[PDB]
Amino acid sequence: PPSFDVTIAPWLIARSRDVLAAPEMLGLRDVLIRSHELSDVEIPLPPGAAVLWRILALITARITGLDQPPNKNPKRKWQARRSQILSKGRLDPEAVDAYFADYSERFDLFHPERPWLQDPRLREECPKTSGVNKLAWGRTAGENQVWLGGHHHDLDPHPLDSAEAVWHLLATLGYGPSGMCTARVVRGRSERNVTAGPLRGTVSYHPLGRTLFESLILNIPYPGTGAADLAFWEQPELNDPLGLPEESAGLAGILRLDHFRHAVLLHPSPDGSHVVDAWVTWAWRERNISPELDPYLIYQTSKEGRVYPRPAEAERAIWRDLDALLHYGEDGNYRPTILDNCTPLAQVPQEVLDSLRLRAFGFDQDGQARDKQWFTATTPAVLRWLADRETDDNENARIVRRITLARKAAEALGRRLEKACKEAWKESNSGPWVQHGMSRYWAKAEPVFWNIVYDRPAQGYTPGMAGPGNAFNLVALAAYDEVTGPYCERPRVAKVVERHRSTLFSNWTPK
Amino acid sequence: FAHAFTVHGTTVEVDFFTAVDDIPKENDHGSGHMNAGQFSAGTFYRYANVNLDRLVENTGDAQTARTAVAEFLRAFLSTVPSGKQNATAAMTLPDLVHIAVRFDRPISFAPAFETALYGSDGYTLRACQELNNYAERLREVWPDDAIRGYATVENKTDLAALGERYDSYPALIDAMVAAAF
Amino acid sequence: PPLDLRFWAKERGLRGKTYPLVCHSLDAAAAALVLWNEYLSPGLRDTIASSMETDEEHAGHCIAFWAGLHDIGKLTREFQQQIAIDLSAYPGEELSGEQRSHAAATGKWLPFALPSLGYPNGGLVTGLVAQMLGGHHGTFHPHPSFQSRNPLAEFGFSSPHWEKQRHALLHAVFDATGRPTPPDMLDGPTASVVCGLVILADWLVSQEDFLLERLTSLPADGSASALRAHFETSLRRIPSLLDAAGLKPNGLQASLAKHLPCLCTGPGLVLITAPMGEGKTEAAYHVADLLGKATGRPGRFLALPTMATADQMHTRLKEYAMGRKRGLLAPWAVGTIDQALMAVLRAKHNALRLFGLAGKVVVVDEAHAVDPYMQVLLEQLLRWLGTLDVPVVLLSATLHHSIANSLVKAYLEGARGRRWNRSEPQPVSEVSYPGWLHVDARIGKVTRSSDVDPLPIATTPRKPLEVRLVDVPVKEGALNRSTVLAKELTPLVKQAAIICTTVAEAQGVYDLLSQWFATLPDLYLLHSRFPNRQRTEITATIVDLFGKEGAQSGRRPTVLVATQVVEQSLDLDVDLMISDLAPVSLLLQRAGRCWRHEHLGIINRPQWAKQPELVVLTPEQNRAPWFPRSWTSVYPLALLQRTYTLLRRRNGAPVQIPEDVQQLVDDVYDDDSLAEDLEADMERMGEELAQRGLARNAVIPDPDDAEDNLNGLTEFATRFGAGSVRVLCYYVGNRWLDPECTVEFPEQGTGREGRFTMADCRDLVARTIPVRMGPWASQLTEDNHPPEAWRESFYLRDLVLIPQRVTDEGAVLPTETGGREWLLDPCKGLIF
Ligand SMILES: [Fe+3]
Ligand SMILES: [Fe+3]
């Protein structure tokens, strides 16, 4: 029978901390056990990476972290403990096999009974099949138009590699459209609709270090003390489509791995290394918001008391690795809690912290069913090089002070410009300018950033001074002034555009 | 097919326009809807390549291919887009047409128009003689045995580097498609 | 280095004068000490001192020095350069433009300078104390994350001159405070309460005059002598501002007072559940105060979900024993539940109010009228108080096992500092009525009435109540009250309570009965939306009619149409009462009035009434039931369906109070057979869990989750959306407060600079009316906005103005406000 278990089957692109030549495919247990030998692991899809890194962190926390706080000043003692595992250096192989021993039967993707994070009952009970196209991302589904991402005419379905199948699967199981999916007949009841993904339209922030090991344990959020729960593949009995999803205070319920809003399935091929058909449909119909908000995302509060994740923006990805630099700052309410409990000094890491790097997996999308773009963002190691190469304490501090300053002020004027354009266009008619203004603003303002980091003569301000010298502010005046320039001719638009244009002039600290 | 950019810096110009309703109340001048539509004029440069080499294969009858490329060139000069033409009739013909048959690689003359042209005078003659100049230095720096022909709606200048000045567009196209094999 | 006196600490309203920073630091520290001895309770000081492994002497010393450092971050350049001050003396540290606040400056500089004084570099104590005082303006900042081996210079502190001066100030206040020892450890909560302390002392000495007051004996220099003197003079008289600011028993009582004095060993909580109006108050303050003595904190605090209860028991209960967020700062204070619950709400300056609740053993009321949202909010609140070793008490009517279970469970979690695991058995899966419950912190054993006393506890005797569902015809989705009117209200004219679902049949049934009343019993209206004064006169003429003085006075009658206002501690005893379909809990509260005081038995009423009979209005069949859209838009459909199905299987049998019905309010939540509509059942269950989830994402973390770090204590004008708000309806046309356009609606009042007197508070509050949250609140206008001069008062901001337009001759017009027109009539009150 066809079978494919993530334990030993190679599906993760992994590369060691060595030469950095010829990286190759590794399974889950293999990349975990010898993580100490591997630099890092990755998969081409940033959504699939944002969920992959969550299950990896949850596994390493199932064995390494022990994902269970003791009871004597728990938080503190826990930080100590994990600092000891970090001090050791690697994983215990008998612990890895000791954890799979309890679940060696769970990880098969094509298990004929209770597969890996799929719904076996959904095999029957579904009149039609959703098709592999809907499972694969960037691939034309039934109603989409066949222009982009390679033609796929709903027919001659190019079978996907089981690796690509677990990538797209793991991503769709995370980020997922909302609305009009394949119908299911539950207990004689049919309901064709589906809810959105839990992480849909949000940027994720995962810290990464020199070796994959410290990255894994640094990606361990403090397990909220509570009723110990299990991830999706550990539950002994398959969930009920009706009924309220089980509640979980434990990390398995805060990493969004206890219950998913979707339910996919892979139809195996006789060969066993290809998927031919798939099923994508609703798994839970009654709404439920997850308590103990996600530590990876950045959350911002609106009026009325609701807290929501800051949505992604392709406009920020116009320059590479923009959000990656959040390790500087930090920043005013704009900081994930996982970082707020693993990057600072109130924890007990000693020297891996001096080589920590941030990474960001973002996939901007509309909250209903329309997708726009994905992008990864790994911080530039050069910004570390500059701080280390000089070996002068006062200069080592002046450089990082210059990067922190330039970054903070950069995004400050970015958002100040956003509200400037939103009020300018919303008041001109009594918007479409934000897209152009922001895109051109970051695209133009990042070479200035690299211009300030190398203390080279930048626009507006020459090297030598303390901080950013108030230069990209002038870059914001440039972008804003040109995006709305040809339209501020008549006095109406001129006076409103100007009235909102007299804000960029602040902070604006003189010479 | 290449994008068509102007040969001289041209800034958009705001055309203030208004709609007038024909049913007047006892408070006149209440026009239909005030608004502003941007327009711009100028002398565009255009360029395109046809690779009969890896073309005729996909087809066959060099005569059918010959008909397709000849009608293509005539359509390339003839056509003009259909954007807001019913409100700004901008139907025109190219003031200069240069078809060249190269046996090694296609080449564009876009960089000839890199340094924008300042005006207060016309731009067609200056553009013609400047394209000539660029064809001369490029021709004397990358020598090659290629065919060149051109038609022009101005008998003032003599364009040497552009080949043999044919009399008209369809004659040029006929002699060049024939000369192409 | 000689300390300079040019640097400022206060500049607002000093008429061109500058106040030295050192004097502010010192007098602030003095405030910390004097409040640490005169203000704070010995038991709470035992809690904080115990949690920090130190003793009163050195703990107080430490926190005093900490308060003396609260504003040390002011020694930047962007702070003093705010006004013209000569800075050419010490160059360097040019303007970068980070916009850092002085609180941020101190919070980021302290972790790297004080290690010369003994705190472990990079440790936890210096971090928690650093961010602790660095967030002295209500918002806490993250711990310092640096990437350069010279953190002092990367944060913008590079000039040795400036650093030498701030080190000089540090040492100055250090020997001035007596040079305390370093505490080996600290935890989050301790840092939070003491943070409330430091911000309190800051705002304290902060006030204007002061300032001008002592603004005469300014220090000529910065030597230890002059600073010792100034600090010593604040120590001379700080309490000036302190006092100047104002800071036959029943069975149950005999059983708690009898056996409870043995169990009162320490901090815990007592959940008391007694009948309405029976006197649960006496046992509440009796046990509450005995336990307060057991813990050693005199002041208390009661949170009530009303407004008149505060103004009535404020005096009723006092003779036997000013700005926003400082109300809780009084030793004896009692207010509503919103200002207390908001302490754990994720808002700025929460540590202040949390500190206010840290010193009082709090008591709370009506935990039955608390939706899952509010329930989990106050739930975590009492969990925190749990980890702050403060005992509490709760008064409530009958409560399901989930409520009690989850609350005592939360507090127990605060006692142990971690919540239960997979196998931990629930502490309260059974609760009696009347029945008390006491749980202790350090032991954890939960005790009830049944454990030691098998014999039941006696209460007010009464006749078993009977309920009879009557068939009411449905017209246009509404109900035809006419039928019931002419069916059961016939023997009344020869000889009454009418409870409605909402305003529809409040003014609907009152008008539907006004015609009838014109034929001529008496028809008076008292309901949800009446002018506080108007319904205070109606309530006076009712509490004196159907209440204590009704039987006791002797002029007892020979009809009352109301809303759920009867739900809150009213004195009522009627033989005839007619109400609509509602939750079993609501039937319990409202129905806790049928033959209320038969105990006294002095009212002689005709033979007509001989059995306690409540009639529940309900729609009928046309197989699962269905209810009106307006009744179930505020109540749960599945719940009401369970009430219907449960009342049907009674075969019109009596229900005893307080013994038989409690197992039915528990039962309705126990057996699923009472509801066959799975969609509705799991719908309201779905939305209750979704609301609780919508709550747990806007509240502070758990006790230990925030132990090592206090940043997760402020992630940012929010409030709560459920479910009532106090409103003011003014008449505009000109602004006048009365319907006869005599008293003008004032822009500001009678006081210094328009300051509102306490009597101004009692008057403007005496002019309110309660309106419930509705879709009209989504669309608010400008006329509803109060002027800026009014926002600085706590009791008046949450009062939106609903204007109305009176004409030239006095006619009142319903003015639209949020898609609806409001009209204040003297008979039916506000109409919309
Ligand atoms: Fe301050
Ligand atoms: Fe201060």
JSON list of C-alpha atoms and ligand atoms in Angstrom, two decimals, chain C residues 9 24 70-71 74 102-103 136-137 202-203, ligand 1:
[
{"chain": "C", "resi": 9, "resn": "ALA", "atom": "CA", "xyz": [11.73, 68.64, 37.56]},
{"chain": "C", "resi": 24, "resn": "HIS", "atom": "CA", "xyz": [11.73, 66.58, 43.54]},
{"chain": "C", "resi": 70, "resn": "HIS", "atom": "CA", "xyz": [11.52, 57.76, 39.40]},
{"chain": "C", "resi": 71, "resn": "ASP", "atom": "CA", "xyz": [12.33, 60.90, 37.38]},
{"chain": "C", "resi": 74, "resn": "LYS", "atom": "CA", "xyz": [14.93, 63.77, 33.05]},
{"chain": "C", "resi": 102, "resn": "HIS", "atom": "CA", "xyz": [11.91, 60.91, 30.68]},
{"chain": "C", "resi": 103, "resn": "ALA", "atom": "CA", "xyz": [10.30, 57.72, 31.96]},
{"chain": "C", "resi": 136, "resn": "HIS", "atom": "CA", "xyz": [6.12, 55.51, 36.16]},
{"chain": "C", "resi": 137, "resn": "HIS", "atom": "CA", "xyz": [3.73, 57.15, 33.73]},
{"chain": "C", "resi": 202, "resn": "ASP", "atom": "CA", "xyz": [4.95, 61.13, 42.35]},
{"chain": "C", "resi": 203, "resn": "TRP", "atom": "CA", "xyz": [1.46, 62.38, 41.50]},
{"chain": "D", "resi": 1, "resn": "FE", "atom": "FE", "xyz": [7.69, 61.61, 36.68]}
]
